[PDB]
Amino acid sequence: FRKMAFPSGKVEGCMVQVTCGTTTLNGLWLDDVVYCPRHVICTSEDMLNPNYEDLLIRKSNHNFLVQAGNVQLRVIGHSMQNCVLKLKVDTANPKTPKYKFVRIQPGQTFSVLACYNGSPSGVYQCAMRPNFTIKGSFLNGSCGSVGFNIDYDCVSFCYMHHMELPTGVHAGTDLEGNFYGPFVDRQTAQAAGTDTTITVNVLAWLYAAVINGDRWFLNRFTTTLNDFNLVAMKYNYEPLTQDHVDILGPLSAQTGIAVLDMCASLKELLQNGMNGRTILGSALLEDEFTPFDVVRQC
Amino acid sequence: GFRKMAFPSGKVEGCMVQVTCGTTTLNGLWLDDVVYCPRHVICTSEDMLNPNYEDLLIRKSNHNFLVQAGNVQLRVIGHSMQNCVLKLKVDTANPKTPKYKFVRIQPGQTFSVLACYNGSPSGVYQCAMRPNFTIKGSFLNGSCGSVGFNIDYDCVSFCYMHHMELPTGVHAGTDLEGNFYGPFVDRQTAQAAGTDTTITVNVLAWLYAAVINGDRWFLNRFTTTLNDFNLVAMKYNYEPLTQDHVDILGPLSAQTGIAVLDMCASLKELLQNGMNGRTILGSALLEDEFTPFDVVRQC
Ligand SMILES: *[C@@H](O)[C@H](C[C@@H]1C=CNC1=O)NC(=O)[C@H](CC(C)C)NC(=O)OCc1c(F)c(F)c(F)c(F)c1F
Ligand SMILES: *[C@@H](O)[C@H](C[C@@H]1C=CNC1=O)NC(=O)[C@H](CC(C)C)NC(=O)OCc1c(F)c(F)c(F)c(F)c1F
């Protein structure tokens, strides 16, 4: 198994750059709207604690430079929705895919198209951590880069990049401008909660091992969801939700191993360790492959 | 931060088509008015074991080839074979053809793979050409004709087209002239590769990356000569480090202030003692599919 991203072409056709003064970041051009982080309107000095409502009242459409490549797109309206700026432009993007805006849950994965000056540089797979940070690869000028999933014809945009935390992890918003986690778009020292292991993905990984014939860790017992959750928390594993149990359904069906039986096997691994054994050629349990990701590669 | 990063695949997605002959369907690459695909599309079950490709191809007509770009069928007006690649001339030019070239990459170099099925892009990931000329990919039935590539400025350099899986689960294919990487053959037989080695210049680049991201537990105040490092490397089936490799690592040496041969001394200690439970950049194993260029660009 490797981290595999979605093909990025449909998102590449939507990337633009947005400039205020000398501050340039990336924006997302869908139909006749460009979406970008609101701190494009901040002077580097006013990022310490911005008054965004006041900064925006001083702004007019003609203060925003939006370019697709070197081609200017005229702005004909502007508004702020939470931490994102919406710029109405006079041209509908002819490359607009079928799309939706979704708010993902911790543990879910997505592809990130890292962009600079509206030009894509690379694509990679990310997982949203339980503490609502992602372990991205972002440099200055990357803000406005987006995270997405593709289902059939349709791009689901789930993430827009806004900042780096002191520990080197990244934080941002959905495409409605609502931050993931307790973060704010201010150049102030902020800390994420202690991270935990994404239990539902570890289970998916154990199912994947079974599908490939590596099944030494299966035991003869089961557990309740509540007993498993209380034990899991003592090992800094995320508790399982009902949605987690449901998304493991297809893999449970494929293998014939009930979700709660796999939980009992995982509890034994937590309590007894690997005792020098490997699973899928690894002594470490992987937690950034979702049940969908496993199916995508099996 | 530091992730395995692939090139944006849009320019390549615009070239992928579906190619069918008989009950065999795989992917093709449509550049200008030519479609490139693996020649084994013309085989049947009984052909696969020892296909006489020149014989099988002379028995085919242009109309035995069904090329589909989305909902549109492209008319094949010509066909020829170049080594293990079939070239189908079509009556329409692909307007989405990027600026491109065909290159043959060296072992140790990396490239992005756009995995496709029935002509439709499925996923994108970064691979390295292994020293034994395999690649560790994620390829299923129907993935043949998927390509590997690098992008420089606006130019797509195609370096790989996918043809087969080996019993060990690694993969083999050709350049776009149809010549295999490695000693493999496009016939339905179980083939083993030569002994693989670890790409040492890449492991060093990845150790520099871990330092750039604040992770330095594995460093030491020992040093080594290049030849004495290479003796130990070869003992552990690591590729020897050349002076060109040392030079390529300069920028990373500069950025971190850590002499290349000091990083070689750190790697030597890791080879001899192991990680003792520790991890580097999250990994329990030393990673060798990031080049110095890959590390620098991403930092
Ligand atoms: C995009 O504009 C940019 C991307 C950022 C910079 C390099 N890697 C990244 O992820 N985002 C910012 O510069 C952002 C703008 C704010 C939200 C208005 N600020 C930021 O990321 O700085 C983080 C930060 C900080 F604010 C500190 F005070 C600090 F001490 C830090 F160490 C730190 F990382
Ligand atoms: C594309 O047509 C396909 C891709 C392949 C299939 C599953 N994963 C992949 O990468 N290529 C083939 O199936 C290829 C066709 C040949 C070149 C005519 N054959 C192949 O990959 O199987 C190899 C193989 C084999 F031929 C054996 F006999 C065997 F015992 C194997 F274990 C084995 F892997």
Side-chain angles (χ1 to χ4, degrees), chain B residues 40 139 141 144 162-167 171 186 188-190:
Chain B
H40 72 251
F139 286 123
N141 272 337
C144 286
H162 182 52
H163 294 243
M164 57 196 300
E165 191 161 289
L166 308 188
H171 297 101
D186 51 339
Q188 190 76 17
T189 61

Side-chain angles (χ1 to χ4, degrees), chain A residues 23-25 37 39 42 47 50 52 138-144 161-171 179 184-190:
Chain A
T23 309
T24 298
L25 38 64
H39 70 253
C42 295
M47 291 177 178
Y52 282 110
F138 290 118
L139 303 178
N140 292 328
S142 63
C143 285
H161 182 48
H162 294 237
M163 65 190 318
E164 181 172 299
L165 296 172
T167 61
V169 297
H170 301 96
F179 259 91
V184 292
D185 48 346
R186 294 152 46 178
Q187 187 79 24
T188 195
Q190 304 170 56

Side-chain angles (χ1 to χ4, degrees), chain B residues 24-27 38 40-41 43-44 47 49 51 53 117 138-145 160 162-172 180 185-191:
Chain B
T24 306
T25 293
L26 43 64
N27 308 281
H40 72 251
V41 67
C43 294
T44 90
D47 278 326
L49 248 183
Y53 281 108
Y117 300 89
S138 313
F139 286 123
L140 309 178
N141 272 337
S143 63
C144 286
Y160 179 85
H162 182 52
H163 294 243
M164 57 196 300
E165 191 161 289
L166 308 188
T168 55
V170 302
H171 297 101
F180 269 86
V185 184
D186 51 339
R187 53 161 67 169
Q188 190 76 17
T189 61
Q191 302 173 45

Side-chain angles (χ1 to χ4, degrees), chain B residues 80-88 90-95 97-98 100-151 155-220 223-275 277 279-292:
Chain B
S80 59
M81 179 166 75
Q82 179 174 10
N83 300 311
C84 305
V85 158
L86 174 70
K87 302 191 281 195
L88 304 178
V90 291
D91 57 5
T92 342
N94 184 2
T97 304
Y100 73 93
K101 51 195 191 180
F102 289 172
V103 300
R104 182 160 182 101
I105 56 159
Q106 307 297 314
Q109 292 197 263
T110 57
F111 58 96
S112 294
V113 173
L114 178 68
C116 300
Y117 300 89
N118 296 114
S120 299
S122 174
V124 60
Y125 53 91
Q126 195 79 344
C127 286
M129 182 56 61
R130 306 297 309 163
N132 70 352
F133 289 107
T134 68
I135 75 175
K136 303 168 183 281
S138 313
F139 286 123
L140 309 178
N141 272 337
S143 63
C144 286
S146 293
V147 297
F149 61 97
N150 283 278
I151 305 179
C155 189
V156 175
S157 303
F158 293 99
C159 59
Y160 179 85
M161 184 174 265
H162 182 52
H163 294 243
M164 57 196 300
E165 191 161 289
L166 308 188
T168 55
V170 302
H171 297 101
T174 67
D175 64 21
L176 267 294
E177 289 187 336
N179 286 315
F180 269 86
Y181 295 101
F184 309 107
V185 184
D186 51 339
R187 53 161 67 169
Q188 190 76 17
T189 61
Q191 302 173 45
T195 291
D196 206 15
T197 46
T198 302
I199 307 160
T200 310
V201 64
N202 292 0
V203 175
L204 292 170
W206 176 78
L207 293 178
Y208 277 115
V211 164
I212 294 174
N213 287 274
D215 196 357
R216 349 157 40 98
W217 68 263
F218 50 83
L219 296 185
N220 66 30
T223 187
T224 184
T225 70
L226 181 62
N227 182 73
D228 289 334
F229 170 75
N230 278 339
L231 286 172
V232 176
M234 288 179 294
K235 185 181 177 205
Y236 289 88
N237 258 328
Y238 273 51
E239 291 286 273
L241 197 66
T242 67
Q243 182 64 43
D244 293 335
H245 290 158
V246 177
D247 296 329
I248 295 147
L249 287 164
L252 290 175
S253 189
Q255 180 168 348
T256 59
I258 298 171
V260 176
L261 292 176
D262 292 350
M263 198 62 90
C264 288
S266 299
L267 178 49
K268 193 194 285 178
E269 178 175 41
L270 289 167
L271 296 182
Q272 293 178 328
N273 307 334
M275 294 178 70
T279 68
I280 300 156
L281 282 175
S283 182
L285 301 162
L286 305 175
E287 170 73 42
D288 75 338
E289 305 205 343
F290 294 97
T291 70

